Amino acid sequence: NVLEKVEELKKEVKKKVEEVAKSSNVEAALIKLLEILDEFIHQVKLLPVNEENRPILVEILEIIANTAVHKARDGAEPEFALELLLRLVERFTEAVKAIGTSNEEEENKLLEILESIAHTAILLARTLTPLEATRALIALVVAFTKFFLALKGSPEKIISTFESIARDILTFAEQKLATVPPAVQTVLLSALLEVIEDAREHIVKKYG
């Protein structure tokens, strides 16, 4: 029945994740993990989703997310890993949209996955030029805004998590922009604040 198919999906994804994790040259691992996530999104979309099978799908997604985040963090050219992480975020948004919503614990798992992704991406952007870091950060914030719009759940947790992510983004911006003349500080900081305020305004209107 549903249990058998879900467990078969579990096993297949588990073997593929192990195999890709074992490998070297993390960029190829990232591409393979993205393709695995895509085929998994397709298989989930085909199968009928109910409240019974949600936890297993969520933990499969968590396994994929942890493996991909660790592989990306394992060291590579920062810009490449940044775009790979953005595509991962978009695919994960599609995944959570397809999954649906359930008991709060799975939402907590998804939120902590999101937060680990944010931390890893900030850590990777830590070593770029100020302008490139600004571009990566604003695009990444837009991606999180799209995700938070897609997610369904109790507003308080979503708002608090988004505000916390915003605080980390702003703190890193203040850290990094210190090595430029303050005119560039004004420029980039104003851009980042405006985009993050726009994201906040949408999330507030949507979840108000």
Interaction with Zn ion in 130-149: which residues (CB under 5 A)? none
Alpha helices in the chain (DSSP H): 2-22, 26-46, 54-73, 78-99, 104-125, 130-150, 155-176, 182-207
Longest distance between any two alpha carbons in the chain, whole Å: 64
Shortest separation between residue 179's beta carbon and a copy of itself, angstroms: 5
What residues between 148 and 167 interact with a copy of itself by CB under 8 A?
Answer: 149, 157, 160-161, 164, 167
Closest by CA position to 37, among listed 60, 71, 56, 8:
60
Question: In this structure, what are the phi and psi dihedrals at residue 158, rounded to the nearest 5 degrees?
Answer: -65, -45
Binding of a copy of itself by 134 (CB under 8 A): yes
Q: Give the x/- contact pattern for a copy of itself in 17-56, rule: CB under 8 A.
A: -------xx-xx--xx--x--xx-xxx-xx----------
Closest by CA position to 121, among listed 174, 152, 79, 155:
79
Shortest separation between residue 56's beta carbon and a copy of itself, angstroms: 19
Local structure of 171: helix, strand or coil: helix
Shortest separation between residue 180's beta carbon and a copy of itself, angstroms: 7
Q: Give the x/- contact pattern for Zn ion in 146-175, rule: CB under 5 A.
A: ----------------------x-------
Pick the closer one to Zn ion by CB: 12 or 38. 38
Angle at the Cα of 80 (from 199 to 165), degrees rounded to 5? 30
Binding of Zn ion by 90 (CB under 5 A): no
Contact residues: Zn ion, CB under 5 A: 38, 70, 74, 168, 198
